[PDB]
Amino acid sequence: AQNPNCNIMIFHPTKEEFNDFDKYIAYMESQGAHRAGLAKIIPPKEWKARETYDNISEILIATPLQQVASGRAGVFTQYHKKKKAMTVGEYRHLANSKKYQTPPHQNFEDLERKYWKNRIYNSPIYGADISGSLFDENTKQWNLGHLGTIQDLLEKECGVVIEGVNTPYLYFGMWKTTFAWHTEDMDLYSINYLHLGEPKTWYVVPPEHGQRLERLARELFPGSSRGCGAFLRHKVALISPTVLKENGIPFNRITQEAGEFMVTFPYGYHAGFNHGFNCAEAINFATPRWIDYGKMASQCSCGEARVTFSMDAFVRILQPERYDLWKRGQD
């Protein structure tokens, strides 16, 4: 069995290996990369996502989200308070202000310590979940707006044509902006490219151990757990590495820098934080190996998780028994 300790693997494809996206994902899996839940892909030195980032300041962040925490430093929830619209140039200036900027630090490890110690005492503002793309249309390799669609994959594997579309999303971050512990909708893959700016730190639980993280979360968030049998779908709960280690939960950590891709694999729980002003692009995708995870994915039916139009068909075809109850949650 390849990668039996479930370590995060890092790949360096050549420009020739970078042509065929599906083939390269299958290669990484042949080496055991999925067992970690997360892999890093460093693009060939010849590749670029676009020529420059000099002309992005006029993108609008229609609904910036202020991330307000409750709890204790290693075990907390966050809610999102909607703020007034602002442009990317306005948001960059805000990120660089004395109130919001990254503090002085020695290295990534010192910054990680300061994040876990201090996050709860501040409410950073995240420009998350913005439909769009920063890849140039002429970039042919690993262009997240030109991938094979999940609907087309389900059709190729299962023979059923379904409605729905699959487009990328932009994330503009600042120091301390946070992504809570989650897997993807329908336990899909995700791919995330860090276009510019400061790093993003990731934590991940191997898929084979995901239920250990769920059982800890039910213990640590006991009211949430009574409210919903899949409350991590709400994407609100944070648990620190120190707390995970104290409770024996297997995990790994890695920092992504500008110009690097990360792939999350089906049922790989992940969480993390941004080091300073940055922009990332991400999209979900599927492979044949996903189908069995999609059939078994948990679902939130309490009404909180509220998701895209395109998830309807995935539930309806892959999970027909659950369909009725899940749709009640969505309406």
Ligand SMILES: O=C(O)CNC(=O)C(=O)O
């Ligand atoms: O970058 C972020 O805030 C969150 N991203 C992801 O969870 C992802 O790409 O799967």
Ligand SMILES: [Mg+2]
């Ligand atoms: Mg612009």
Ligand code: NI
């Ligand atoms: Ni994710």
Ligand SMILES: [Zn+2]
């Ligand atoms: Zn729920």
